[PDB]
Amino acid sequence: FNDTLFGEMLHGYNNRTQHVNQGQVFQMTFRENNFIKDFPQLADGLLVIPLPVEEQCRGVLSEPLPDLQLLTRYDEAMGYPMVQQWRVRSNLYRVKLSTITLAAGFTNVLKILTKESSREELLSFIQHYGSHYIAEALYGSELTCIIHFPSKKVQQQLWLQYQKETTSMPFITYLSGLLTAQMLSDSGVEIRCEEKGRCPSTCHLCRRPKEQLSPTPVLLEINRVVPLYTLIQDNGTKEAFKSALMSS
Amino acid sequence: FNDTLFGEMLHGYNNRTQHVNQGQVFQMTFRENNFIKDFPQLADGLLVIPLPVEEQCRGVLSEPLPDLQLLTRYDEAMGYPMVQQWRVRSNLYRVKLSTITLAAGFTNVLKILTKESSREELLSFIQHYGSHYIAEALYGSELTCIIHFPSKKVQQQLWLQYQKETTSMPFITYLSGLLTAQMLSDSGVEIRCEEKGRCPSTCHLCRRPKEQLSPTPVLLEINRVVPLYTLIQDNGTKEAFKSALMSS
């Protein structure tokens, strides 16, 4: 119901619970032709521009951090278990909102809320339409990887020896290769990766055991959010909104 | 895994996402006999006392508020649709925490976090064990009711005429009675109610179409929460904890 692609900027954002898609503040109109190549008609009022090719597909290897999640005692040889993060991003898109046309339902519920300021009613309004609406957002396909290690010396030895094998191929690729090496001769190590948004075939780093072309970019990360009270225009519900916003 | 009744005070509380039960900070021990009548052995360190009989089972009728959720235009006769809230509470319990014995895993992950202060590591620690632990909490069985009305004059007419019929029976009971009256002669009104925690047979207000005796009180509402950094004792991770706590 009332859901399109790019997409989630329309429905707003609840800020205390970090939930998106709640209520509809503007109207998805198809008058303007804000088209994107190889994608259908988009709602009006939003401006979307892909990331530069320099940062279109980029993989970051976060610093090796101990494994605290699965650790829930000091040992010199044994870990100190380590985990690694390898986050690549492909088909990334910026989305702005210039300039939006307001909906009738949201402005009407404002009107019935502007004329008389009430406590429980404003609280329920916040619980429905959230408390803020998003301005800029970053969509795309993100492959997040986590690597489990037994000790602290093992991932350092792999780090240095792989630094010597490379110095044509990156770290995680040959890492998975020598992982397939122990599958031939047997050690007890597992690698986990999950993707938010299916990844295109334009980038090699995110290919999966097939491949995909022009996938639907999912909401990766947030940028700049703007509150909802500054849109009501009358102070009697400005101070009531930002006042009832601090209770919980 | 590592879950008992009363219960959730042990696992902590994530504060930005309002999620409970994440990681284990203390140890559930059964040495002390903090027993409650008609309930098994409870973990040590917590003190639980039932609410007074005056507030043991209490039903509040919130002020009639317009129906904004289903409204997503001005009309004089028609609504302005209204909804009502009827929240009763039974088998309520206070829980405190005096005095708790710490776990080995949480103090160990602290130790490996106290000795060296790191950014990503402290962030992941917060994402696991939350950011705060709860001190006082209110459990019980809560019946929340919401009533849907078409107009603004209809629930006022029902309010006054029911005030005249009563002045032996409350509002919602005879309300449901005359609701069954229209089921005999036909209008298009529905009443919704949901319960968090099954309700005992000690109170009549929360009985359901059978009855239940001594149900397990669920976590109703929160009271006083205490942060987790003030428990690490060393400032090098105090300022690192409360500093990495403000980024997101």
Residue numbers in the entry:
A (entry chain A), B (entry chain A): 718 to 789, 793 to 887, 897 to 915, 920 to 942, 944 to 982
The authors write:
The N-terminus of the endodomain structure is formed by the canonical MACPF domain consisting of a central, broken, antiparallel four-stranded β-sheet that possesses a distinctive central approximately 90° bend. The most distinctive features of MACPF/CDC domains are two loops containing α-helices which link the core domain β-strands and which undergo refolding in pore-forming family members to generate a partial or complete β-barrel inserted in the membrane. In ASTN-2, the first such loop (loop 1, linking strands β1–β3 and β4–β5), comprises 19 residues and contains a single-turn 310-helix (η1) and which packs against the Fn(III) domain interface (see below; see electronic supplementary material, figure S5 for sequence alignment and secondary structure). The movement of ASTN-2 through the endolysosomal system suggests that its activity might be regulated by pH. We have determined structures of the endodomain at pH 7.5 and pH 5 and of the MACPF/CDC domain alone at pH 4, and find the regions of ASTN-2 resolved to be remarkably insensitive to acidification. In an attempt to investigate the effect of reduced pH on the ASTN-2 structure, we obtained crystals of constructs consisting of EGF-3 to the C-terminus (residues 649–1288) at pH 5 and of EGF-3 plus the MACPF domain at pH 4 (residues 649–984), though in neither case was EGF-3 resolved in the resulting structures. For crystallization of ASTN-2649-984, the protein was concentrated to 15 mg ml−1 and crystallized in 0.1 M citric buffer, pH 4.0–4.5, 20% PEG 1000. The crystal structure of the MACPF domain C-terminus at pH 5 and of the MACPF domain alone at pH 4 were solved by molecular replacement using copy A of the structure solved at pH 7.5 in PHASER and refinement was carried out in PHENIX. The conformations of the lower pH forms of ASTN-2 are very similar to the equivalent regions of the neutral pH structure (RMSDs 0.23 Å (pH 5) and 1.52 Å (pH 4)).
Our focus here is on a PLP especially identified as being involved in neurodevelopment, astrotacin-2 (ASTN-2). ASTN-1 and ASTN-2 have been shown to interact directly with each other in vitro in a calcium-independent way with multiple regions of each protein apparently contributing to their interface. Both ASTN-1 and ASTN-2 are integral membrane proteins in which a large C-terminal domain (extracellular for ASTN-1, endosome luminal for ASTN-2) is complemented by an N-terminal cytosolic domain suspended between two transmembrane α-helices. Thus, the endosomal regions of ASTN-2 comprise a smaller N-terminal domain and a larger C-terminal domain whose structure we report here and which we refer to as its endodomain. We describe its unique combination of a canonical MACPF/CDC domain with a minimal epidermal growth factor (EGF)-like repeat (EGF-4), a previously unobserved type of fibronectin type III (Fn(III)) domain in which an additional two β-strands are folded across the core, and an annexin-like domain.
